[PDB]
Amino acid sequence: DEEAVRSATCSFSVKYLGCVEVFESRGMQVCEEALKVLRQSRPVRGLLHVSGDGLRVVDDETKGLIVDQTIEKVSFCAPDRNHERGFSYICRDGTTRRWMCHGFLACKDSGERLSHAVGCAFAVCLER
Amino acid sequence: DEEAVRSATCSFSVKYLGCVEVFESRGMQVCEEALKVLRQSRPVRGLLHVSGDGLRVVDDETKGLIVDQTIEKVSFCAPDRNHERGFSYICRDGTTRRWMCHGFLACKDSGERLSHAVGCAFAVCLER
Amino acid sequence: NPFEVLRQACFENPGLN
Amino acid sequence: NPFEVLRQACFENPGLN
């Protein structure tokens, strides 16, 4: 997956759960509490593209870009320790000056695989 | 329930999930992580008696006393924030020098009701 | 943001001995 | 004690800016 992230051929089929404000910029418990809020709120099926250019989510049904996140503003990402396909990341929304947690359910992979790929995107972006 | 605890007429129908060692003597996250371990392990149905004399669990099927916990060695108790009928307490097992979390599913009540009754038992025992 | 979700009994024993 | 239960990938971004 590292070469795929570098080459911009890394994508995962996901259900995007939305986002929710959090008050810490990192932490697995922080992400898991956010995921609980997201789950208690209909997930949108799409493709999560992971590259040094950003995390982009494209909706399967409309083919529209619904998440376009620069890597430089993502602080932390993690698999959900309690759900094997769960994944989230925390980012800084500079326009509202908030930390936001974006949540996912991976359709075909472990949440750990998604987290490792986003960690690769951290490394690639810094390299560049 | 306070008068019932003082009078030794306070009992709740429960499923007893067992116990597991923990490394802190208090905390809702500590209890919830312990409950997760207990749930990932067949619960025993019985009656949880709450009084200044102890927390006693009697198995419905054998009528045997399977938990007999003095109040003085119980440090903390809490409802499960993620399951309305979940309840646990942490106690000191002096013979093995361990903190142990004992977990329950209330059959007919909220976990908050059980926790409030055990908190009453704390007060009654100290009073006496 | 239509994908944003808006955000919406324990006892210590003083006689522990 | 037959009621006792015995006990048995995240990344920070160094380029956060």
Numbering used by the authors:
A (entry chain A), B (entry chain A): 72 to 112, 115 to 201
C (entry chain B), D (entry chain B): 118 to 125, 135 to 143
The authors write:
Several repeating motifs have been found in Pon1-228: type A “FxNxx[F/L]” motif and type B “NP[F/Y]E[V/I]xR” motif. Proper combination of both motifs dramatically increased the interaction with Numb PTB, whereas the isolated one barely bound to it. For example, Pon fragments containing either B1A2, A2B2, or A3B3 showed significantly enhanced binding avidity to PTB compared with the isolated A or B motifs. To elucidate how combination of A and B motifs can strengthen Pon’s binding to Numb PTB, we solved the crystal structures of Numb PTB in complex with Pon A2B2 or Pon B1A2 peptides. The complex structures revealed that either Pon A2B2 or Pon B1A2 binding led PTB to form a symmetric dimer-of-dimers in either a “head-to-head” or “tail-to-tail” organization. Pon binding could also induce Numb dimerization in solution. Despite of the distinct domain arrangement in the two complexes, the A or B motifs from B1A2 and A2B2 occupied the identical sites on PTB. For example, the bulky aromatic ring of Tyr154B2 (same as Phe120B1) inserts into a hydrophobic pocket formed by the side chains of Tyr87, Val117, and Ile139 from PTB. The side chain of Arg158B2 (same as Arg124B1) forms hydrogen bonds with the backbone carbonyl oxygen of Glu92PTB. By analyzing all the PTB or PTB/ligand structures deposited in the Protein Data Bank, we further found that the newly identified B motif-binding hydrophobic pocket on the Drosophila Numb PTB appears to be present in most of other PTB domains.
As the first identified cell fate determinant, Numb transiently forms a basal crescent during mitosis, preferentially segregates to the basal GMC daughter, and then promotes its differentiation to neurons/glia by antagonizing Notch signaling. During NB division, Pon together with Numb is basally localized and is segregated into the basal daughter cell. We found that Numb PTB specifically recognizes the AB motif repeats of its adaptor Pon in a previously unrecognized manner. The multivalent interaction between Numb and Pon can lead to LLPS of the complex, forming condensed, autonomously assembled membrane-lacking compartments both in vitro and in living cells.
